[PDB]
Amino acid sequence: AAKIRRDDEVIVLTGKDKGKRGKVKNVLSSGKVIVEGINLVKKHQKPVPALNQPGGIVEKEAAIQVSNVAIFNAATGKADRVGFRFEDGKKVRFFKSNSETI
Amino acid sequence: MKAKELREKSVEELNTELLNLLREQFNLRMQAASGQLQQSHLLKQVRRDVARVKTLLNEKAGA
Amino acid sequence: MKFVKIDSSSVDMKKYKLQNNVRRSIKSSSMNYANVAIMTDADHDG
Amino acid sequence: MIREERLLKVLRAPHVSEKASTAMEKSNTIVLKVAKDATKAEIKAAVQKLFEVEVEVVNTLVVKGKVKRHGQRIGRRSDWKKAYVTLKEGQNL
Amino acid sequence: MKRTFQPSVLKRNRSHGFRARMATKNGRQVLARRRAKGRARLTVSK
Amino acid sequence: SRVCQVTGKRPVTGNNRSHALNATKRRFLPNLHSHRFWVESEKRFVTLRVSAKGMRVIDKKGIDTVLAELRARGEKY
RNA sequence: CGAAGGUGUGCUGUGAGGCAUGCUGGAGGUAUCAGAAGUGCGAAUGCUGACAUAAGUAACGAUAAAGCGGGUGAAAAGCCCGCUCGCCGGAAGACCAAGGGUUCCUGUCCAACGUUAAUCGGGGCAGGGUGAGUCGACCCCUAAGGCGAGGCCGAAAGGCG
RNA sequence: UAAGGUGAUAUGAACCGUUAUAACCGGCGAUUUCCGAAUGGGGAAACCCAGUGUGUUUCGACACACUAUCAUUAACUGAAUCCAUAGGUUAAUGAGGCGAACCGGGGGAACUGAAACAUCUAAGUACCCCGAGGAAAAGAAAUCAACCGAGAUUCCCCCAGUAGCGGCGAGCGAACGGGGAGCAGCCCAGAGCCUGAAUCAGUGUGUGUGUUAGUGGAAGCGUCUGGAAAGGCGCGCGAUACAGGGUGACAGCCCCGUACACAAAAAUGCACAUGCUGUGAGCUCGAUGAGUAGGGCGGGACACGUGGUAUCCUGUCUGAAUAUGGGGGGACCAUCCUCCAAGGCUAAAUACUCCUGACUGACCGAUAGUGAACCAGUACCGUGAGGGAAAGGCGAAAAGAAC
């Protein structure tokens, strides 16, 4: 019943990075997701003696709300909205505004 | 695995029931507690395998 | 997750209220009972 | 049968400590954890099978749990059982 | 001075223990109230 | 339990009312007695705890006609 | 391009009060006109919580008693070792039950506790530790006493046995 | 249904899956240690000790089933006195116990008011106990009224704080009659005639209907500030959906959802007919509830405190007739009218909410509101019954602070 899922392509509706594009990383039951090289927060990390102890300041991919993002049509090359249909006998996804199979 | 284990002799699965315990279950409860076992997951499914068997055997025989 | 010890001051508090009300209430005339001897002299019933 | 079965449900893990190591090398005697019930005869049989070794004799006890405080909460460890087990001269472990 | 409470485990059971409660009319409807308020200690025991 | 094995009479609560009309509770006891009744069928006796009015009944109704009732209710005689 | 709330100033009204704005704070408030009120505080030996006072005053809990050198360490009178002094010694010694419920041992830490410092501790954290044919429980027997099949008695509950 | 998950406080380590026997939700299923009515005996609860039987290695020793009480029924038996009873043994069925309120019934206070106070009130309240249902109990005239009649019960609104009771004091307090809610009436005491003649009850069969899981679900962009825009400015579109909630500041068109339209493999409640098992029909001639009514003595409920007192129930002593007879109509006789007891059954209108679902609020917003928004009936106190707390907010995100 979900629209975005484990692997897909998207673009930001609003926020810090608004107008920037990337694919999916992993989905969270919190209502959030992660994207590669979009949401970036400098973390001050502790040098754990176990294994390596780098400590230092590292950059990471922060979680983000779903409602602030939408798929990247990659035809008009901009935002577009999902709908659910039954193709053959199977539930699948399609675009609004130029309805097309995904 | 039910389907794989649904078709057998009541003793056959009863053998497998036992067999699980001789090696495996016991050992992992021993091998692991010492700290030598590097794989925990092997413990979960095994206990989950037994109950399936003991339910089958009770489904076939008796009630 | 980064909490400051535990502050049990509230323990000695509840013990103070409990201790104070217990005696102060049920101790009754012990100060006065003792005062009773004083009570029998300091009175001057006339 | 269930007889052999239960034996596999009795033992849990071997105990480890200095006192344990001494009886091993010195008295040829071993320690291991057991069930909350796990009587002597019940233990010895299992030892006679899986380890397939001789047994002088068995004696056991009960170990109480040690109260603890996590955060400000307080739990209690589960009372359990250990057994000092003895071996004849055909020993290996 | 000899204080009032003198601990004895047995007496603390024969009198206020469960089986004495459940053995008479009043005692049985007591534990209801104890269960009614949802108290964790129903009678004195483990 | 003061009762008549026949009728069902059992005591009742009422007032002791003085000349000044001061009220006090009391109890009314049905007049009872322990009598040994004869049966011609069995040619034996039966011992029952009844009242004096319950005897007036048995004078009218058949002794065995009464037992049928008791014998119906499980009342043990 | 800043509400409420807080904190000041200036004006204003016959009065409880009203208006603008300076600093904070970071999202709500509400004209006007009617309506309903858990509706306006100084008290009530008032209730709750917070903080002053006397005051760094009294007190540190038996008058059996300490002194010194080394060690630890950030720091030593109170911790460890050593030398000396003294006290009890039908106890201030040594075993048990009843009752307590890890307080036992080791390692380890100075926040809180200990009426003071604490490298210490019955404190905090982790780990370790409690072996029975002969001990005691368990178990056989029972006294005082309780429970008490049926039974008796009793408005019911129930009481006796 | 499904591309994620392996509950939470807390991440982490080790694993399965990616269109389908991952995971999640629902239904139908054995699993369900020990205490607890415990029910094999006992008993300071979560413990101790058995018995019988059946079956089982490697004797030792194990697994499983049963064994409580009482009521009823049947069988076997079976004392003192032959018989017989009584008692005992065996199996079958049933129950106990827990729980918020609501209902009926058996017992049943006092403070207080009276300006004292005993009568009276408070009150048949509080409280104890017994029993049952989902609703209960009551109920189908030996009932009222006035010479008119109406037609069982139950509840609501009026008569009316009237008529009356009452140390005539405080106080208590109707009824008839009227308008409404919702209606329903049957059976035994008996024979024949007559037969499955309605009728309930259980059964299945299918239909419909829902209940427990769910599916789809409309339509928007630029710019301005702005940390972040859902905000201002302009032009747009949907609306059987502007209920609502969330997203970095106030979103009809970003997300979840709503209006609306659909769905059940399986088990289920209801209304139907529905095939059956019993079930008992309909008509004629009789019969019509006896220690019972009433009475005496003493109490009690009736609005009614023995008052001139009708009526009902009754502890005790008595005690009539069988419709040509009797009860009643507020003392009472007479006339008149009405109605037939002393055996039973009965749905709806009504009170209730421990709990489940949705929805609402001129109800509260952390000293208020449930005692408790924070793991609370916990910590803590007391021997025990029992009593009984304080304690919410970083931030957008943990980016929580490298060196």
XYZ file of C-alpha atoms (C1' of nucleotides) in Angstrom, chain G residues 6 28 37 41 46 50 53 56 67 74-75 108 111 124 129 139 141 144 149 152 159:
21
model
C 7.819 38.415 31.368
C -0.663 32.195 18.915
C -19.274 32.060 34.891
C -7.542 37.734 48.074
C -5.439 28.066 56.498
C 10.302 27.207 47.456
C 15.831 34.125 60.350
C 28.062 29.651 60.580
C 52.252 7.975 70.304
C 46.762 14.629 44.799
C 46.392 15.071 49.410
C 37.801 -2.068 41.168
C 29.712 11.583 42.703
C 28.668 2.397 44.393
C 31.634 -17.921 46.927
C 9.376 -38.006 57.248
C 3.788 -40.559 66.745
C -2.550 -27.975 74.660
C -17.124 -36.417 56.574
C -26.664 -31.861 66.375
C -21.563 -22.351 65.991
